[PDB]
Design an enzyme around this catalytic site. Structure first.
Site, short mmCIF file in Angstrom:
data_model
loop_
_atom_site.label_atom_id
_atom_site.label_comp_id
_atom_site.label_asym_id
_atom_site.label_seq_id
_atom_site.Cartn_x
_atom_site.Cartn_y
_atom_site.Cartn_z
N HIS A 144 19.41 17.17 8.31
CA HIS A 144 20.59 16.83 9.08
C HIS A 144 21.95 17.17 8.50
O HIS A 144 22.12 17.31 7.29
CB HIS A 144 20.48 15.39 9.51
CG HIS A 144 19.33 15.17 10.43
ND1 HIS A 144 19.33 15.63 11.73
CD2 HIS A 144 18.06 14.75 10.18
CE1 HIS A 144 18.12 15.51 12.24
NE2 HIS A 144 17.33 14.98 11.32
N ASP A 174 9.18 18.32 9.21
CA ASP A 174 9.17 16.87 9.01
C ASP A 174 9.01 15.99 10.25
O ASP A 174 8.09 15.19 10.32
CB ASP A 174 10.42 16.43 8.24
CG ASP A 174 11.70 16.99 8.81
OD1 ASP A 174 11.80 17.14 10.05
OD2 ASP A 174 12.63 17.27 8.02
N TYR A 404 23.46 23.02 18.38
CA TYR A 404 23.71 23.53 17.03
C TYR A 404 22.57 24.45 16.57
O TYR A 404 22.81 25.43 15.87
CB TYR A 404 23.90 22.38 16.03
CG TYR A 404 22.70 21.48 15.83
CD1 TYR A 404 21.54 21.94 15.21
CD2 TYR A 404 22.73 20.15 16.26
CE1 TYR A 404 20.45 21.11 15.02
CE2 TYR A 404 21.64 19.31 16.08
CZ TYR A 404 20.51 19.79 15.46
OH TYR A 404 19.44 18.94 15.26
#
Ligand SMILES: Nc1nc2c(c(=O)[nH]1)N[C@H]1C(S)=C(S)[C@@H](COP(=O)(O)OP(=O)(O)OC[C@H]3O[C@@H](n4cnc5c(=O)[nH]c(N)nc54)[C@H](O)[C@@H]3O)O[C@H]1N2
Ligand SMILES: Nc1nc2c(c(=O)[nH]1)N[C@H]1C(S)=C(S)[C@@H](COP(=O)(O)OP(=O)(O)OC[C@H]3O[C@@H](n4cnc5c(=O)[nH]c(N)nc54)[C@H](O)[C@@H]3O)O[C@H]1N2
Ligand code: SF4
Ligand code: SF4
Ligand code: SF4
Ligand SMILES: [Ca+2]
Ligand SMILES: [Ca+2]
Ligand SMILES: [Mo+4]
Lengths: 875, 274
Positions: A144, A174, A404
């Protein structure tokens, strides 16, 4: 000196209105819509009512108190240099983290100018390149990043790094683990790393839902991701419609605590035992969609025989499942019969996929078990599907605005989703160009993020897949090695942030790698002085997104999660205004990279003469926004609420598959060549494969993997209480899901306001300790009381925590959130007990399976006791 | 002379702490001349109480956000010696300057909502962001908690005592420690979740959860509550005062009955095999 001004910006916890006065942020709040200029909301008529969302956005806890992080005193002040580090003399690798080892990190560093910090870094880069090559420079940010599309790691980081080095420590999938390494082989969806499509499910659920089974799902806490509390009212609606909510989670999570009609607490690593007993019941009672299965399943006859116990001599009865999980047989049977006869949606995970259960040692079978159940009940038909109630909002799927994950200004088609659509829009092959990487590719060199320690300290490793293997079902099966043929071993390490001690597995090893003499240099580009930062040689001060210009959309990730803004009640696009000047001597990542570019003689190619704001306008014009308003007008307004598209025909997730017809949703796949006349799933047969053809080929080619059979079966979790020799010494089963009051490490520590939240950290004698929930029966048996400092431990390490005695855990199970931002060793770094709260020091580092190279964190065996105050420097 | 009132629905609290992070954002790094000096880290003007009931596996938990009661008959106004005053709209405020140097102020609170700020040497507490309510520029026109909620727990209103009283009766609103007679202007909905207890169990007939069994709760000998078991064979009688009760169960013509003692604790009778 002036008046207060309302500005706009966003975060990973939602968009916000920011009030500023005299260069100071006064407050941050949720956003209210002005119906005079903001488009009307959608409406849904179902079961006699009219459902329409509130004319307002919502935020998460960590965002509500974000101001305290921006102005943090743990915020990196200015460029720093490790005193014991001498570029032209003794580098003293063995002294990295020395301060941390004597409980005084800050004293290891001294202050230096930006001009010198970069001069030092550049000299290392050029030396290493000409001697070993670009591959000798390792680097990696993490999962992140601070909200902001143009400055997101996929964009700014990649655009600069691709031009300088480099060997990428590609990230393991993950969030998707189980669905990625296991579920993918069963139903495809590689372009979503194994997760399911979710389009238009809200209206379908409101109209048809009678029951919803939340399995390893806590929507209130996770919001899916980036969505604050947007879906809270949707479950309220369902609740008031008479829909029953059932929760299956070792810990009575927050969504359950709020609206559960029934809660089951299975022992860690045993969920697939429940799903097998549920399928068993359906088979014995003919209570499933046989017609559906005959047409869409593959290898079901054989799978069925296994569930009935014909081939292994063990019928998967509810009693058999009880003995495995602790959950009462009668309740498992009751749920099965209700599920079969009711229009039930399976909320596996909090996004529609995901779920802590997937990144555990039983993660592969759980994900396939989930697909199994949903399949037998006919996912895709009205009132039957996989839906977590967080996505499926009737937003305008036709309107296009980049997430993004689509690369921003990098244009890296190999490491971002830029190749799908945005690249084509952002660059014209005439005046603005992308930044490719000829190293961060399969035939180049990368290393698994989960095994960075072994690569540096060991100098060699071999594994399966490269990061997110979403190209096709079998990409994850490809074999890689380190060093890659012809490439060099790692000599330098450029870190972006430093959260691995609290986010990876058996993390003491990440602390140990920093002192290995093979590591000649370590740069750290971060915002806060915490975690791994106190191990670096040079530290560069980065600023938060509130100190720079950017642009984004509410929760819009996209890429491996196409159109995920459907998590929100509205599609809010906002200009992230630079509300204040960068704090201290920090600067934006882009300006840092621009300074290096100038020093590396590539400024023109990297910046194209643009500042962050100029890149924003160019970004803007590459979206559909211009169709509604110019850049100037948008800059002025600050945010834009995308209008509703009432007419578009609805395309419910997986319905086209259920009805045996062509794929009609906006999903990014499957790719044409992965379908026969664009019908069926991406799998070979186009069906849900209970006996995966991809894995059957893999295992027949010689890749034998007992913990990942081609046929979904009950493989006992290798880190569970009844199947691990380890349980003799460590009898307690631990699961460590995502933090309730923080976005992973971004919220915790840093002297933030979140640290005063009762259920986040507990102050005891001046220090705020991390929490571990223990069941009253296990605490009493150990003389542990509420608020006591306890020591959680196993062969991997020791962690000091404050105890919270509760009933929200079946006896024998303990719970503690992961993602601690504070790494604070009581003794030598990596060899002693931590009191910061890094629960991941205790999680297993063994890959889920031999070839399934993912993290199995949520299944960890530990033992607790009252802490006698020792530092336990035995690791 | 319209007044301020706040209604909190306990059944809806999820303890995400957006409120609390709300004051801190409004009061920790800011100073509001006339209302209050900056807040001291560690204080809970907005205090969210947590209470777990019952035992695994039929347990539960509820929360109670507790700001200042700003009661109509405020004791600390009556004993604050002018250091605390009541405004016409009902907001009770501590005078930032007059209250300085007086630790004793805290003890005048039956609710324990004020906190001592060391650096400022003064008692502090909930101001209901009067500084915001007094400003037109603040469009929301409501406190930070209420505005920060994502769970629709708060209902902030400015109306007459007649309107509020009517509402109290239509929704069954209640206050904390009614017996003290301070008359809080902060009401709670579904407060029984937090203050009362329940009795639950699961009925089994021939090894399986039995749905539709009729269950009756009695006290003294008379019915106090009734219900039918869901598909998990469970029933749950909440909002129970301390005392002794009798649970009578009827399923398939088969009868079962037992006593239960409620003493500030909820009871789980377990599986009743019929
Ligand atoms: N506040 C907050 N919200 C977040 C995040 C954060 O750090 N903080 N992370 C964001 C990100 S990256 C993502 S990827 C999404 C992920 O969404 P999820 O994967 O749903 O997130 P988790 O927190 O792991 O939630 C798993 C839930 O499953 C339960 N669980 C864990 N292991 C098991 C198991 O073996 N069996 C069963 N039956 N239940 C189990 C846990 O108690 C937990 O409540 O969350 C997003 N939301
Ligand atoms: N036990 C257990 N472990 C788990 C999981 C679980 O369920 N259980 N969940 C797993 C999952 S899904 C994930 S996604 C990982 C979390 O994976 P992450 O990589 O570990 O953790 P983050 O906390 O997001 O760390 C991001 C880092 O980036 C830095 N950063 C953010 N924005 C910027 C910026 O603009 N500039 C700079 N220079 N730095 C920046 C931050 O300071 C922070 O150190 O945890 C995993 N681990
Ligand atoms: S913000 Fe709302 S749900 Fe959150 S803790 Fe406060 S009252 Fe509760
Ligand atoms: S809650 Fe306490 S501080 Fe507030 S008015 Fe009532 S007695 Fe005074
Ligand atoms: S009204 Fe303002 S001071 Fe009172 S509890 Fe709410 S946020 Fe705090
Ligand atoms: Ca059904
Ligand atoms: Ca509750
Ligand atoms: Mo994740």
């Amino acid at each position: 000196m002036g008046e207060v001004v309302r500005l706009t910006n966003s975060s990973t916890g939602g968009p916000v209105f920011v009030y500023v006065k005299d260069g100071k942020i006064i407050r941050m709040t949720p956003m209210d819509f002005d119906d005079a200029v903001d488009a009307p909301s959608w409406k849904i008529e179902a079961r006699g009512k009219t459902f329409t969302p509130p004319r307002k956005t919502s935020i998460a806890p960590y965002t509500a108190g974000f101001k305290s992080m921006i102005y943090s005193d743990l915020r990196i002040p200015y460029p720093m240099k490790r005193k014991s580090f001498d570029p032209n003399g003794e580098r003293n690798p063995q002294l990295r983290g020395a301060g941390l080892s004597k409980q005084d990190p800050w004293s290891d560093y001294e202050r230096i100018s930006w001009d010198e910090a970069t001069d030092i870094v550049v000299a290392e880069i050029n030396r290493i390149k000409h001697a070993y090559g670009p591959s000798a420079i390792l680097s990696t940010p993490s999962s992140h990043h601070m909200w902001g599309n143009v400055g997101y790691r996929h964009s700014t980081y990649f655009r600069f790094m691709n031009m300088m080095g480099f060997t990428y420590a590609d990230h393991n999938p993950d969030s998707w683990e189980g669905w990625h390494w296991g579920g993918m082989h069963m139903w495809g969806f590689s372009w979503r790393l194994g997760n399911p499509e979710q389009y238009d499910l809200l209206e379908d659920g409101l109209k048809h839902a009678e029951m919803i089974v939340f399995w390893s799902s806590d929507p209130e806490t996770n919001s899916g991701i980036y969505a604050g509390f947007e879906s809270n009212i949707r479950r309220q609606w369902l609740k008031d419609l008479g829909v029953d909510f059932v929760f299956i989670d070792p810990h009575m999570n927050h969504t359950a605590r709020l609206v559960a009609d029934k809660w089951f607490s299975p022992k860690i690593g045993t969920d697939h035992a429940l799903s097998f007993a549920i399928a068993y019941t359906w088979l014995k009672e003919d209570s499933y969609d046989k017609e559906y299965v005959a047409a869409n399943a593959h290898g079901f006859e054989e799978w069925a025989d296994y569930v009935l116990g014909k081939t292994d001599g063990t019928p998967k009865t509810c009693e058999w499942a009880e003995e495995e999980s602790g959950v009462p047989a009668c309740e498992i049977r009751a749920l099965a019969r209700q599920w079969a006869k009711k229009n039930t949606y399976l909320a596996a995970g909090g996004l529609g996929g995901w779920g802590g259960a997937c990144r555990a040692s039983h993660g592969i079978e759980w994900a396939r078990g989930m697909i199994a159940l949903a399949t037998m009940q006919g996912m895709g038909k009205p009132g039957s599907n996989m839906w977590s109630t967080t996505q499926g909002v009737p937003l305008d799927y036709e309107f296009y605005f980049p997430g993004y994950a689509e690369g921003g200004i990098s244009g890296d088609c190999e490491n971002s989703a830029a190749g799908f659509k945005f690249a084509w829009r952002m660059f014209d092959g005439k005046t603005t160009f992308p930044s490719p990487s000829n190293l961060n590719t399969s035939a180049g060199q990368h290393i698994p993020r989960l095994k960075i320690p072994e690569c540096i300290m060991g100098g060699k490793f071999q594994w399966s897949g490269k990061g997110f293997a979403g190209g096709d079902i079998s990409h994850q099966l490809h074999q890689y090695e380190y060093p890659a043929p012809g490439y060099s071993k790692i000599k330098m390490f450029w870190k972006y942030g430093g959260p691995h001690l609290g986010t990876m597995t058996a993390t003491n090893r990440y602390a140990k790698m920093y002192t290995h003499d093979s590591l000649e240099f370590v740069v750290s580009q971060s915002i806060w002085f915490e975690g791994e930062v106190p191990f670096a040689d040079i530290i560069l001060p980065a600023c938060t997104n509130f100190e720079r210009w950017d642009i984004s959309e509410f929760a819009n990730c996209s890429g491996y999660i196409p159109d995920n803004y459907q998590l929100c009640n509205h599609r809010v696009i906002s200009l992230q205004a630079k509300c204040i000047e960068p704090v201290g001597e920090s600067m934006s990542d882009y300006e840092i990279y621009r300074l290096f570019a100038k020093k590396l003689n590539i400024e023109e190619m990297f910046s194209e003469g643009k500042d962050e704001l100029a890149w924003c306008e160019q970004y803007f014009n590459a979206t559909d926004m211009p169709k509604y308003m110019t850049w100037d007008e948008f800059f002025k307004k600050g945010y834009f609420v995308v209008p509703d598209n009432p007419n578009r025909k609805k395309t419910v997730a997986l319905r086209w598959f259920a009805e045996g017809r062509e794929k009609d949703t906006p999903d990014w796949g499957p790719r044409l060549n992965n379908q026969v006349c664009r019908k069926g799933l991406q799998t070979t047969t186009g069906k849900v494969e209970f006996i995966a053809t991809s894995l059957k080929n893999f295992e027949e080619q010689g890749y034998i993997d007992e913990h990942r059979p081609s046929m979904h079966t009950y493989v006992p979790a290798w880190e569970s209480q009844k199947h691990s020799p380890l349980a003799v010494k460590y009898p307690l089963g631990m699961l460590s899901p995502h933090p309730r009051f923080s976005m992973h490490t971004m919220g915790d520590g840093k002297n933030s306001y979140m640290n005063y939240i009762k259920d986040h950290r507990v102050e005891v004698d001046g220090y705020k300790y991390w929490i571990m929930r223990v069941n009253s029966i296990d605490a009493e048996a150990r003389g542990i009381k509420n608020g006591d400092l306890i020591r959680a431990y196993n062969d991997r390490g020791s962690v000091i925590l404050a105890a919270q005695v509760t009933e929200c855990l079946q006896p024998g199970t303990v719970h503690s959130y992961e993602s601690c931002a504070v790494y604070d060793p009581l003794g030598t770094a990596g060899k002693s007990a931590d009191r910061g709260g890094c629960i991941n020091i205790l999680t297993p580092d063994r890959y889920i399976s031999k070839y399934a190279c993912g993290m199995a964190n949520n299944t960890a065996l530990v033992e607790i006791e009252k802490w006698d105050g020792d530092k336990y420097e035995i690791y | 002379m319209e007044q301020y009132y706040m209604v909190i629905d306990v059944a809806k609290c999820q303890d995400c702490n957006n409120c609390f992070m709300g004051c801190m954002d409004e009061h920790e790094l800011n100073e509001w001349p006339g209302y209050t000096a900056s807040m001291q880290r560690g204080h809970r003007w907005m205090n969210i109480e947590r209470r777990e009931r019952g035992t695994y596996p039929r347990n539960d938990i509820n929360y109670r956000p507790t700001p200042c009661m700003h009661c109509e008959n405020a004791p600390c106004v009556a004993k604050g010696n002018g250091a605390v005053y009541q405004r016409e709209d009902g907001i009770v405020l501590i005078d930032p300057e007059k209250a300085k140097g007086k630790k004793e102020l805290l003890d005048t609170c039956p609710y324990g909502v004020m906190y001592w700020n060391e650096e400022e040497n003064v008692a502090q507490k909930c101001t209901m962001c009067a500084h915001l309510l007094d400003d037109e520029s603040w469009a929301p026109k409501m406190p930070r908690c209420a505005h920060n909620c994502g769970s629709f727990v708060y209902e902030f209103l400015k109306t007459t005592p007649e309107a509020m009283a009517k509402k109290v009766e239509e929704e069954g609103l209640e206050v904390i420690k009614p017996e003290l007679g301070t008359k809080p202007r902060v009401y709670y909905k579904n407060l029984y979740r937090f203050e009362k207890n329940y009795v639950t169990a699961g009925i089994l007939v021939q090894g399986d959860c039995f749905e539709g069994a009729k269950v009756v709760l009695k006290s003294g000998g008379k019915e106090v509550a009734s219900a039918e078991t869901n598909f998990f064979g469970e029933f749950k009688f909440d909002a129970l005062d301390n005392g002794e009760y009798t649970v009578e169960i009827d399923a398939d013509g088969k009868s079962y009955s037992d006593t239960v003692v409620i003493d500030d604790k909820s009871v789980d009778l377990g599986f009743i095999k019929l």
